[PDB]
Design an enzyme around this catalytic site. Structure first.
Site, mmCIF file in Angstrom:
data_model
loop_
_atom_site.group_PDB
_atom_site.id
_atom_site.type_symbol
_atom_site.label_atom_id
_atom_site.label_comp_id
_atom_site.label_asym_id
_atom_site.label_seq_id
_atom_site.Cartn_x
_atom_site.Cartn_y
_atom_site.Cartn_z
ATOM 1 N N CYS A 163 0.836 -1.225 0.000
ATOM 2 C CA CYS A 163 0.000 0.000 0.000
ATOM 3 C C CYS A 163 0.857 1.257 0.000
ATOM 4 O O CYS A 163 0.265 2.340 -0.001
ATOM 5 C CB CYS A 163 -0.977 0.014 1.159
ATOM 6 S SG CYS A 163 -2.214 -1.278 0.932
ATOM 7 N N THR A 270 1.960 -7.557 9.000
ATOM 8 C CA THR A 270 0.657 -6.919 8.632
ATOM 9 C C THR A 270 0.161 -5.879 9.649
ATOM 10 O O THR A 270 -0.609 -5.031 9.237
ATOM 11 C CB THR A 270 -0.449 -7.954 8.392
ATOM 12 O OG1 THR A 270 -0.742 -8.617 9.615
ATOM 13 C CG2 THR A 270 -0.062 -8.982 7.351
ATOM 14 N N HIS A 303 -2.848 7.990 5.740
ATOM 15 C CA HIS A 303 -3.088 6.615 5.249
ATOM 16 C C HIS A 303 -4.549 6.267 5.562
ATOM 17 O O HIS A 303 -5.300 5.964 4.607
ATOM 18 C CB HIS A 303 -2.071 5.651 5.863
ATOM 19 C CG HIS A 303 -2.066 4.339 5.168
ATOM 20 N ND1 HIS A 303 -2.065 4.256 3.793
ATOM 21 C CD2 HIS A 303 -2.084 3.073 5.635
ATOM 22 C CE1 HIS A 303 -2.055 2.988 3.435
ATOM 23 N NE2 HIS A 303 -2.079 2.240 4.545
ATOM 24 N N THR A 307 -9.026 0.764 9.490
ATOM 25 C CA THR A 307 -8.769 -0.445 10.314
ATOM 26 C C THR A 307 -8.690 0.002 11.769
ATOM 27 O O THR A 307 -8.258 1.113 12.048
ATOM 28 C CB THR A 307 -7.511 -1.209 9.867
ATOM 29 O OG1 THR A 307 -6.355 -0.409 10.110
ATOM 30 C CG2 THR A 307 -7.555 -1.596 8.407
ATOM 31 N N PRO A 308 -9.132 -0.828 12.738
ATOM 32 C CA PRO A 308 -8.979 -0.512 14.159
ATOM 33 C C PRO A 308 -7.567 -0.076 14.581
ATOM 34 O O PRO A 308 -7.440 0.956 15.188
ATOM 35 C CB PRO A 308 -9.351 -1.840 14.839
ATOM 36 C CG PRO A 308 -10.371 -2.446 13.892
ATOM 37 C CD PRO A 308 -9.860 -2.085 12.512
ATOM 38 N N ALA A 309 -6.549 -0.875 14.261
ATOM 39 C CA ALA A 309 -5.157 -0.669 14.722
ATOM 40 C C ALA A 309 -4.494 0.465 13.925
ATOM 41 O O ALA A 309 -3.798 1.266 14.559
ATOM 42 C CB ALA A 309 -4.383 -1.967 14.604
ATOM 43 N N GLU A 314 -1.740 5.896 13.528
ATOM 44 C CA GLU A 314 -1.444 7.117 12.746
ATOM 45 C C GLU A 314 -1.685 8.359 13.619
ATOM 46 O O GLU A 314 -0.865 9.296 13.520
ATOM 47 C CB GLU A 314 -2.258 7.142 11.455
ATOM 48 C CG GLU A 314 -1.658 8.079 10.441
ATOM 49 C CD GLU A 314 -2.167 7.868 9.031
ATOM 50 O OE1 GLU A 314 -3.106 7.054 8.860
ATOM 51 O OE2 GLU A 314 -1.602 8.511 8.122
ATOM 52 N N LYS A 335 -9.730 8.240 1.788
ATOM 53 C CA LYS A 335 -10.202 6.841 1.632
ATOM 54 C C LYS A 335 -11.603 6.695 2.243
ATOM 55 O O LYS A 335 -12.278 5.706 1.917
ATOM 56 C CB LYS A 335 -9.274 5.820 2.281
ATOM 57 C CG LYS A 335 -7.864 5.783 1.715
ATOM 58 C CD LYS A 335 -7.091 4.574 2.158
ATOM 59 C CE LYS A 335 -5.687 4.535 1.607
ATOM 60 N NZ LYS A 335 -4.932 5.736 2.022
ATOM 61 N N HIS A 340 -9.736 2.220 -0.577
ATOM 62 C CA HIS A 340 -8.284 1.996 -0.539
ATOM 63 C C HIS A 340 -7.826 1.469 -1.879
ATOM 64 O O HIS A 340 -8.075 0.271 -2.118
ATOM 65 C CB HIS A 340 -7.934 1.030 0.588
ATOM 66 C CG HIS A 340 -6.469 0.975 0.837
ATOM 67 N ND1 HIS A 340 -5.929 0.369 1.948
ATOM 68 C CD2 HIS A 340 -5.442 1.475 0.131
ATOM 69 C CE1 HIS A 340 -4.620 0.486 1.904
ATOM 70 N NE2 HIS A 340 -4.297 1.168 0.812
ATOM 71 N N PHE A 399 2.203 -3.634 4.195
ATOM 72 C CA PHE A 399 2.688 -4.960 4.650
ATOM 73 C C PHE A 399 4.211 -4.976 4.541
ATOM 74 O O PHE A 399 4.759 -4.432 3.556
ATOM 75 C CB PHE A 399 2.042 -6.100 3.853
ATOM 76 C CG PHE A 399 0.591 -6.381 4.168
ATOM 77 C CD1 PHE A 399 -0.096 -5.656 5.140
ATOM 78 C CD2 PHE A 399 -0.090 -7.396 3.506
ATOM 79 C CE1 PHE A 399 -1.423 -5.930 5.431
ATOM 80 C CE2 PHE A 399 -1.419 -7.666 3.800
ATOM 81 C CZ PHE A 399 -2.080 -6.933 4.758
HETATM 82 C C1 LIG Z 1 -1.985 -2.050 2.570
HETATM 83 C C2 LIG Z 1 -2.786 -1.780 3.840
HETATM 84 N N1 LIG Z 1 -3.776 -2.761 4.330
HETATM 85 O O1 LIG Z 1 -2.619 -0.763 4.482
HETATM 86 C C3 LIG Z 1 -1.163 -3.335 2.585
HETATM 87 O O2 LIG Z 1 0.122 -3.011 2.107
HETATM 88 C C4 LIG Z 1 -1.734 -4.430 1.703
HETATM 89 O O3 LIG Z 1 -2.300 -5.370 2.212
HETATM 90 C C5 LIG Z 1 -1.558 -4.303 0.215
HETATM 91 C C6 LIG Z 1 -0.771 -5.426 -0.369
HETATM 92 C C7 LIG Z 1 -0.827 -5.481 -1.853
HETATM 93 C C8 LIG Z 1 -1.805 -5.064 -2.620
HETATM 94 C C9 LIG Z 1 -2.387 -5.849 -3.721
HETATM 95 C C10 LIG Z 1 -2.900 -7.166 -3.244
HETATM 96 C C11 LIG Z 1 -3.644 -8.009 -3.932
HETATM 97 C C12 LIG Z 1 -4.125 -9.347 -3.461
#
Ligand SMILES: *[C@@H](C(N)=O)[C@H](O)C(=O)CC/C=C/C/C=C/C
Ligand SMILES: *[C@H](C(N)=O)[C@H](O)C(=O)CC/C=C\C/C=C/C
Lengths: 412, 412
Positions: A163, A270, A303, A307-309, A314, A335, A340, A399
């Site tokens: 992300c 994550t 961002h 999400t809760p966490a 942030e 968002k 997202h 991630f």
């Molecule tokens: C973004 C977030 N939840 O903040 C995190 O980086 C994420 O899960 C994106 C990973 C990749 C994106 C495309 C995935 C497709 C299955």
């Protein structure tokens, strides 16, 4: 001995519109682009809504014969890119083509194509896989096809930082120009993860809002009833340009890119650290990069994924980095409206941050009916706030604990 | 004003061995790591052989729990990375952890995992997708998991530039250090696309050798009977370090990274231009970056994938860039033995280039029985050639016409 970098062109496909001005109208109006998904049967899935790009016509850009080969993420990326180059007024010539490069990234790239070629392979066998599967599906082919279409011979690459992809792609393209590797870069992100694997994958990890009864109310950053992010599709592309190259050709300059921060949480695959220590480090790297006092930041595009966490992490990071000034600045999550866009999130949000400067207005956090414990900042609840903005900051967290921050300021 | 960057650690999984020394022994012996594939039924495929990693034990690096969720491309990348950090003797502390980053990339990342989650989705539906599918499959999670395991808080990112991924990852990590964004970077690439989609995908595009009757004779760069590349698996990782940081801690220095070049062909999605004009520009950018005369290059580790068009285009490029000196230097393709590691090709070949310097020997181009029209350079046919080497150059070319060149020199 680094050069200054400005934004001279922007392009976008979002759940709110098929270009920047139409998307930005949506943002300032507090409009949701979130709706039940219609391109596939989601009956067996716990989430059945998302941010689709509505009414996309690739034939505005490419021949149907060409586009048949290309995964939607590449179509979306080329559309945003083509828009940004047009918007820049830049003319590509034998004299500048080696100085113009491309860095358009994606989280996973051509997932729909991969899913479809997998169906063919399993149901029918490998003689039914498309000869165009690889060049039509891998992440670097937005950069690839854009360079082929426009004759761009500068640095040619793609990031994939989950992300954070959009933010990093813009930041590192700026570094290319700052350090003399190129004079111009087309940079940003495209994502089309609205297939079984994407909605099922995030579903299996329980990362997605399941508010199927009120899809427009699902994305609610910093609200106590938030239950995960909303999967959305699209692309953002900016033309980044060395300041003198821009001044020399009489370019319209949107904003200056002054600060880029990257950092690793090195905490979890994550989940973010509760105190947002990695985000805090990243924002401080970007401000130091920009030579700015924290009190010079007026607007943060969070961002803020709902999400809760992630949302409270942030808030903590902003409170750590800005202290008492955290109550003076405005922070919003676009968002709340767009959902997202994953690898594209940072590119569209870079554009929204630049437009916040151009129009001196903080985009709203819609659906913020009941701010959670400790979410006591100016989060621009419900409605756009006209206000002074000389410096805007945009965050992305991904991630792998990967962090990116972009700092833009009004150009003199 | 930019800082010097040296190689203090190297790691590898290749078809020739489970570490660098075992792989390098294979290279200097003219050994092929190419064999019939055994981990899947390839009866319906026109190519049934490739470069597999033999005997890999992930539990030398991770717990069963740590490894189970991760695609092989992440396992392979972490193994090469962990080897490179160990090999550097670097100690990570509170004092240096924000100065140590990671840039490990991949062409397509977790294809085997994508294939497996798709089987479940098609056969049983989305409740059978792994909660760990996304964090276990996406390309940036080598960089992510390495930073989490080792507590690395420096720049955290991943490139995906097709067959150029390894070269770009190394070059841009070097830039991070040269320009003071980090003091240490773990950089390279990993790939495991030996599945239906990989062998079927490249098969459908007719890119792969179909010499199923003699798999060790299939990879034959610049030979008149060549019929496409050999798909191979593995990983390469280098510890890049600022010169004074290395000297200060008493690090063993393999070589100096002096030059990095990128360029786009902006010609075609899969074919290179006949005259290799993009490759030529890229090699010249790297030599300019290094402040070197073309006559200072002694060894080129070619892209040399064993395709009809690619091999001759690379000869043309070398002839253009080096003129009369093209007949003095030695150029070889280690893919004659390793096959093509795709997003890892550039990382393992960076390591082979560094070792060519350490041991003053040009690796062979095996299977070069009948050099094609125009392939009249010193291609080191059949057998390793001991020779003077003070500067080694490594090329990678990718889909999208994306080019990378790395220039290494012996460290004083
Ligand atoms: C973004 C977030 N939840 O903040 C995190 O980086 C994420 O899960 C994106 C990973 C990749 C994106 C495309 C995935 C497709 C299955
Ligand atoms: C390889 C080349 N020498 O042209 C090409 O760039 C490539 O590897 C494209 C795809 C990369 C790897 C992942 C794909 C597997 C199906």
């Amino acid at each position: 001995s680094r050069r200054r970098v400005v934004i001279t062109g922007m392009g976008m496909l979002s759940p709110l519109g098929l270009d920047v001005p139409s998307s930005w109208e949506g943002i300032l109006a507090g409009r949701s682009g979130i709706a039940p998904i219609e391109h596939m049967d989601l009956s067996a899935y716990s989430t059945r809504f998302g941010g689709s790009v509505k009414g996309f016509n690739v034939e505005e850009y490419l021949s149907a014969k060409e586009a048949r080969k290309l995964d939607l993420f590449i179509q979306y990326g080329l559309a945003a890119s083509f828009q940004a180059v047009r918007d820049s007024g830049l003319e590509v010539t034998d004299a500048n083509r080696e100085r113009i490069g491309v860095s358009m990234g994606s989280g996973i790239g051509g997932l729909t194509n991969i899913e479809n070629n997998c169906r063919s392979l399993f149901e029918q066998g490998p003689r039914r896989i498309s000869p165009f599967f690889v060049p039509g599906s891998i992440i670097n082919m937005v950069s690839g096809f854009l360079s082929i279409h426009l004759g761009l011979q500068g640095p040619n690459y793609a990031l994939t930082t989950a992300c954070t992809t959009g933010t990093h792609s813009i930041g590192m393209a700026a570094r290319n120009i700052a350090y003399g590797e190129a004079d111009v870069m087309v940079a940003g992100g495209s994502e089309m993860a609205a297939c079984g694997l994407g909605l099922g994958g995030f579903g299996a990890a329980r990362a997605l809002s399941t508010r199927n009864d009120e899809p427009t109310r699902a994305s609610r950053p910093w609200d106590r009833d938030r239950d995960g992010f909303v999967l959305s599709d699209g692309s953002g592309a900016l033309v980044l340009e060395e300041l003198e190259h821009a001044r020399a050709r009489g370019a319209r300059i949107y904003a200056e890119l002054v600060g880029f921060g990257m950092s690793g949480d090195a905490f979890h695959m994550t989940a973010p650290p509760e105190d947002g220590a990695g985000a805090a480090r990243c924002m401080k790297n970007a401000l130091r990069d920009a030579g700015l006092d924290p009190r010079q930041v007026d607007y943060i595009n969070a961002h803020g994924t709902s999400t809760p966490a992630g949302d409270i992490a942030e808030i903590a990071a902003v409170k750590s980095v800005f202290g008492e000034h955290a109550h003076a600045l405005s922070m919003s999550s676009t968002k709340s409206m767009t959902g997202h866009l994953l690898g594209a999130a940072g590119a569209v949000e870079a554009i929204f941050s630049v437009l916040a400067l151009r129009d001196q207005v903080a985009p709203p956090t819609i659906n913020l009916d009941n701010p959670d414990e400790g979410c006591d900042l100016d989060l621009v609840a419900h409605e756009a706030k006209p206000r002074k903005i000389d410096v805007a900051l945009s965050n992305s967290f991904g991630f792998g604990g990967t962090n990116g921050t972009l700092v833009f300021r009004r150009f003199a």
